[model samples]
Target: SPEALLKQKLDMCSKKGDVLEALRLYDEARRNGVQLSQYHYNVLLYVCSLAEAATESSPNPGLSRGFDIFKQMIVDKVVPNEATFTNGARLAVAKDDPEMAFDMVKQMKAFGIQPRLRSYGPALFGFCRKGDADKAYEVDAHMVESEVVPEEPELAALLKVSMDTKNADKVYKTLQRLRDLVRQVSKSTFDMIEEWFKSEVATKTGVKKWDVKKIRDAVVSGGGGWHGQGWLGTGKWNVKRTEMDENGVCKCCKEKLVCIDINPVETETFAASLTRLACEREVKANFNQFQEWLERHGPFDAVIDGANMGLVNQRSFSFFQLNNTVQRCQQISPSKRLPLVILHKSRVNGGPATYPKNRALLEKWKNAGALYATPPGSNDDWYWLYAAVSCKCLLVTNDEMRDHLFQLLGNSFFPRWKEKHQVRISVTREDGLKLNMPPPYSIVIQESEDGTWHVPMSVEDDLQTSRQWLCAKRSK
Candidate 1:
């Protein structure tokens, strides 16, 4: 009777979306030594889910509260019912851990509670949302074995998962199954599937024509409106090529125009075309050579930026001193792992190679093959970063790389990789060089809401702030 009366009040709080008041009443009921039912816990969990689903403004909003209740339920020896399990599964899904959500369903089976559609729906939807077609099919198969035939909307969701993963065979099979179950699918669904196939065919056959206007539109609309000057300019209305015949073959008109047809206005990005041009030249050794170099001389603990380290010794700095500091620091490790140091040719020859004492230090390192020099008039930062990235070794640098030039590269996937692969070097006169490491790569893989996983950009937000700070000072 006490449990029923409390639940009636709890139901009203839930309906009103007053989660805080409901939680307070729950605590008060437990404090008074009233025996709580599984229904009470389920209702409480449902309230938390509703609160979380209401807004994205709050961080992990009510999932923590729901978890606290579930943990308390376990501690109090309260056996969770089917509803309780489903709600717990829903909570896990909200936290973006579909693996744990399915585990909750298994937990239900362990407790001798037969799972209903409610028990499977949240878990299945979670897997579908995560774009894990294999897991979604596994869950779907389990539901079929349990004699729980999914409804049209649920079938549609699975079809969407198939589309998202671009699993053609699964798409064909799911569509046939859906057609058997229902008389007709929606026109929009068919349209999207048709478009997906068209894109796939375009990719495989390479029959897609280059749309010059589409490229211009994408670039101009990408950010600000184009002016009549620079790259973002809009004063282009010329296509002076040789006349084409009726059969689409080029017809030589008077003097034959001997040239390769490379259109910049019809490319994805300017950077992409530039990268293509760079690849065409191919003067330097490729990434494979960098990897080979690491295999030959490396498996080193870390890659050192000698110039970066040289800057840290403001009081008494030289390339030789920098090299000595790095070697001494490496010796501090139990195994005394040798580090691969990349130095600019200027830094090595200009300072250390010129002086007799420093020249001896350089010769010692060069003899032991501890150093690499960038070619004349070349920036060695790329070499240092590439070597570290290829070897999966740490890069020691103080640079956050928030400048426009870095932003060009930073706009790519490098920022995410750099955050994990990068090591910040801290130094003191007594301590020498101390390396500050980031969290492991395994821990940094974050999935967006749409199930796209990416290494997160660590300094992405800081880049904007620093720019704002500078602009604010200039205006003031």
Candidate 2:
């Protein structure tokens, strides 16, 4: 009864973010020898963690009480979950003892409690802020070994420490890691990289004589994107902050940014993964037959979602509208390519397909080997998505692709892949159909063979390609 009462009070306090009230209630409960479940204990610890973050200016005195609260959890035999350890870890950092926070993480692992990327943040960031590069690396090493992937902030901390110590090699490796982690650079992260390149240390770090052929070959190998090689020249750096033109060329240097798709090997693997995911969700035979059909008839210029394209500006499904979209797409390319249209069987079986004109249009598409009518009780989303991925072609639809199905595809690389391939369309009575092509260049931190860097700045502009960028390079 007493534990439940205290739990209610704690929940109330937590909702208000009243850490002081929470700590006082905990003290009163402890004096009366009352305790809550591990969940409620974790709640108390969570409030303490939040309080530790706030104890900045003027310094909240009661925030330090979290240390004692965590110690009491162990004394009370309240087994710590990941949250408990993270709370304790945050508390440790507030006290200027990252080693204590790190040890708590180690203990969490011993209990077989999986550590999230956030669980390692307090220790990694604390060491980074202290300029303790060695300890920061130690934490990073542990995370990698534990299979805990670090996100931008954690990697940025590593970058900060490496750059502060003038460890060019480490910074280069971390930059490459960041590129793989996130293609679009955040302002703060991009600023750190720009600052490092602008430094005298960075100018002095490169070789005076490098094989230009080798550097050129490396950049070409990555398909006009960034090269894997580190810095290439020794001299004062040339830096320009400028906007990218419509064709994704740097306004200052006038060199165009290249947008390379994932290679053939990656596409093949992606196709297999997509097939596996589809089969796992859909009927095995249904997806298999579809895959076989796709293998034989696909490799189209685009895959269009029939329902999504057809229903645009229409209160009901319109086969004429759908035909117009397919026709429009076919006309866009010089190849006049036939796009694979994915529609549900019901669309062609009974409703609109009964009309003479709609039926005629259906026959035309079928004769051209361009229509795929997914079976009864099957989702057309998967079919179109699978077809697009298998073919590695542009996809046309208004769907945001943020549904449960899309969530199965991991976020990191999926967005990058989609950025260049998803084609949005608008249909108005006057305009008929207007296409919005994907950006001409990848909105990423761009690096050139000649040791030039183009870090795209964050922008509120709807036209992502038009965003301004920071261009840092070696002097001629």
Candidate 3:
């Protein structure tokens, strides 16, 4: 009866997404609340991990907002049980990170938790999801070494892995196992797997059975652009081949292009592509490039620059940030020169001197070698300029301007930039600080309209119009 009661509570916690609470209840028996013999803290953690995994695309700590709970468990000496390891493994899988999944498996072992065959499945899935089936099977080898039998659930997991990777031989074995073990596999699952197998055959041997419709759908959902660049259409393979570097680092393509904020035209200030890459478990590893770039170009001492900086005079601030790298260079060393080249957009009557928030110097490096024509009438050209030159520019604007940028680029612009170069950081803020780490590297795009888009934007003032489309009227 007590076990049944505990199970009920644990189920409730899981259903509600209150993983921490479920864990607390798991200890009720051990903590003298019920004098129980079972320990499933890891199980609860697994559930929590799964939820968190689905929520974020990366293996970074802050993604799930649950690192605190993990710490608390360690502090309380609530030794993690098998379920806990299972949860960690599941999270690693959900994050689509094989390294993490394997690492979590190690953690499970450290705690003397003997995982069931079903337990290793998540990590296997994670590797396959990464499109690395070879690595996924490496885990299977480990399972064998550990004397773990490949059971029904384990086989199912492998089947799923095969389906994801479109490994025909593997799929054949896994599917055969599936038929022997279970009465039913979902139609959607079977159909998708069959299609994937066909695609894989086509890919490997130049055969043809994969439906074009299915291929198109896969490409679009994979963030294929509306432009001919969509994953399905022409010349995709050659582009893909170049991207892989012959090492099988097969990630999405847009990740190859760099985002140039375009404020500065001469020297590019490319933003790292944060969208697809951010959620990778190996973000710390990925950040090596950023670290080098930062060291070479910076110790960026940021400033708002001169008088015409602020949300009110956004246009002027944008121009200044685009063309002024001198101040940043000077701050680092007096001998260093500011790479400043002033450009005009049309000379509107000089307005009041107000301070606007901008990364004036950062932008200057980007805008160097560019000239302007008085303060221009429409900011559209400015937006294009900023995106083109590959500047990591920042602007201080109200929600209005930020939304405007999103409207023009279509969704693909920022996303594409992030995928190409490792330049995706848009530090957005209206009142509070919100770092919009999508793609197109370290560029910060801030704005202020009560803050949370729940959905982020690529450019400042870009998403102000529609939740999906930026079709609103122009600002004053």
Question: Which candidate has the top score in TM-score?
Answer: 2
How big is the positional error of residue 339 in model 2, measured in Å on the Cα after superposition? 1.8
Q: Candidate 1 lDDT, tens digit per residue, 397-444?
A: 777666654555532245445555676665567976566665332212
lDDT of 3 by residue, 1-476 (tens): 87667777777777776755765675565675563322444445555575544343454342243333443454455666555555555555555556655755555566565655555776776676566777778888878777775654556567667766556567545544443333123434444433443353423422223355655564354332111111122111221111211222213322222122423222332233332232232244333433333344422222122222222235444433322333332444344534222222332123211223333433434454222222333332232233223334332222232255344433324433423322111224564222222233222211111110010122233323211111111111
Where does candidate 2 clash, by residue pair? none
For residues 82-169, what per-residue lDDT tens digits would candidate 2 score against the true structure? Answer: 7776666666666655775676667657656666676688788889999999999998998998998777888888989999998989
Ranking by lDDT: 2, 1, 3
Candidate 3: where are CA atoms >4 Å away? 1-96, 110-112, 147-168, 183-185, 192-476
Clashing pairs in 1: none
Best by lDDT: 2
Q: Tell me the deviation in Å of residue 312 in model 2.
A: 6.9
For the record, the alpha-carbon RMSD of candidate 3 to the native fold, in angstroms, is 21.4
Q: Which 10-residue window in model 3 sums to the lowest lDDT?
A: 446-455
Instruction: Rate residue 303 of model 2 by lDDT.
Output: 93
Give the winner by lDDT: 1 or 3: 1
What's the TM-score of each model vs. the native? 0.35, 0.72, 0.28
Off by over 4 Å in 2: 1-97, 109-114, 130-132, 161-169, 213-224, 243-248, 256-261, 279-299, 307-322, 333-337, 344-369, 373-380, 398-407, 426-432, 436-443, 458-465
- Per-prediction tally of clashes: 0, 0, 73
- Superposed by TM-score, candidate 1 places the C-alpha of residue 103 at a distance from the truth, in angstroms, of 3.1
Model 3, residue 172: what's the lDDT? Answer: 49
